């Protein structure tokens, strides 16, 4: 038997970081950028009128006056989205709408309110200087500007930013891929009708969901059945596409020796118990030439969720390379009696609450499948030597935040 801490070190040290991938920018939401992204186009890609008015050469409308102290033909009209090139000649105007592309060789927009507003010939009534009322090409982003840095989490604004500079794909740190497998001759799928000797496969659904909640990219393989040669094939196929593997029913007695022997042919398998309750019976192994973490969990659904919460979820967070998401631990007054095993750390699924008057934290232990899987939002963490918890005791509660 080893301690929870020793087991936690073993599994976390073996975590595999997923290979970076180039993906459609819509599919990068929430993922960490694995590259520096520089703009390739200028934004805006062309000089545009900042207002409604007349594209001009400033010098033709008072722009060259020494600051310390006749009409122009309107040779076109341009709305936003226009695609035909224009070229200003000297002493000409082009009437422009907000966003319209500036004619070539213009350098200013004369505001409509600073003109006589003439349709074919326009008169300036106030001067404008070169550059005024133009959104210059590249005013928002220039080619080579850093749009997104490696290490940044890609949210909606960054996805918008990637689209603005014409990037449709980006290199990201993908979610770690986890495959969830159930073995056991007694298992049937939940669309079946179980007979004598048969049990619904609960664990593949609950643990695939726990892996999704933890941030993994989960494939629920479901039941793996057959002679061990066929089961070896299944596990090998999941090793090809996984950073983490979870197998329930592989540990806990002689019935799983055939599967365990297959696992020892695929890698190094350790089945020493952890000094914890529930979940002392578990295993851990590294499969293949890349040593994929493979968690061997028991058929017990409550013990399996506790093992997943304690050891698998940390590896998912590390594999992910984003935040640690380490669970908050609060101190609470125990509402009811709990017993615990001397020498094992206890993990009791519980109800954490706030006292309506004191504002103190209260915890009600819930420990039978219904009570174990009923709605729990915390776990009392009982130290190895404590054997008894009385109402009023102050205990550690692992807060199991929703989602």
């Amino acid at each position: 038997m080893r301690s929870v801490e020793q087991q936690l070190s073993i599994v976390t040290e073996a975590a595999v970081a997923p290979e970076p991938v180039r993906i459609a920018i819509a599919e990068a939401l929430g993922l960490m950028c694995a590259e520096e992204v520089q703009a390739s186009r200028a934004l805006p890609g062309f000089a545009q009128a900042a207002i409604d008015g007349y594209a001009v050469r400033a010098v033709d409308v008072g722009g060259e006056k020494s600051l310390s102290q006749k009409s122009l033909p309107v040779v076109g009209e341009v709305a936003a989205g226009s695609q035909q090139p224009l070229r200003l000649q000297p002493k000409q105007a082009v009437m422009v709408h907000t966003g319209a592309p500036l004619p070539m060789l213009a350098d200013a927009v004369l505001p409509m309110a600073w003109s006589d507003r003439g349709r074919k010939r326009v008169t300036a009534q106030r001067p404008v200087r070169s550059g005024e009322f133009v959104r210059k090409e590249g005013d928002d982003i220039q080619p080579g500007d850093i749009a997104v840095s490696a290490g940044a989490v890609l949210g909606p604004a960054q996805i918008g930013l990637l689209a603005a500079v014409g990037r449709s794909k980006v290199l990201v740190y993908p979610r770690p891929r986890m495959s969830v497998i159930s073995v056991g001759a007694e298992l049937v799928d939940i669309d079946r009708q179980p007979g004598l000797g048969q049990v619904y496969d609960v664990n593949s659904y609950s643990l695939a969901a726990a892996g999704r909640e933890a941030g993994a990219d989960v494939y629920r393989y479901g039941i793996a059945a057959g002679e061990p040669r066929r089961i070896k094939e299944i596990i090998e196929s999941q090793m090809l596409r996984s950073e983490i593997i979870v197998i329930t029913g592989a540990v806990g007695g002689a019935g799983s020796a055939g599967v365990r022997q297959v696992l020892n042919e695929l890698g190094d398998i350790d089945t020493e118990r952890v000094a914890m309750h529930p979940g002392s019976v578990q295993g851990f192994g590294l499969l293949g030439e890349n040593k994929i973490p493979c968690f061997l969990l028991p058929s017990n659904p409550v013990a399996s969720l506790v093992i997943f919460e304690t050891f698998v979820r940390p590896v998912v967070r590390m594999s992910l390379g984003k935040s640690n998401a380490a669970r908050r631990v609060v101190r609470a007054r125990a509402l009811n009696h709990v017993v615990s095993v001397a020498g094992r750390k206890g993990f009791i699924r519980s109800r954490l609450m706030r006292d309506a008057e004191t504002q103190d934290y209260l915890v009600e232990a819930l420990g039978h499948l219904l009570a174990g899987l009923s709605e729990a939002n915390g776990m009392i963490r009982i130290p190895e030597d404590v054997t008894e918890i009385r109402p009023g005791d102050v205990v550690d509660v692992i807060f199991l935040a929703q989602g």
């Binding site: 609060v330 109800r351 609450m353 706030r354 309506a356 934290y361 939002n377 807060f399």
Partner: peptide, 8 residues
Amino acid sequence: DLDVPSFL
């Protein structure tokens, strides 16, 4: 601090 149910 935390967002938990209330209890009397």
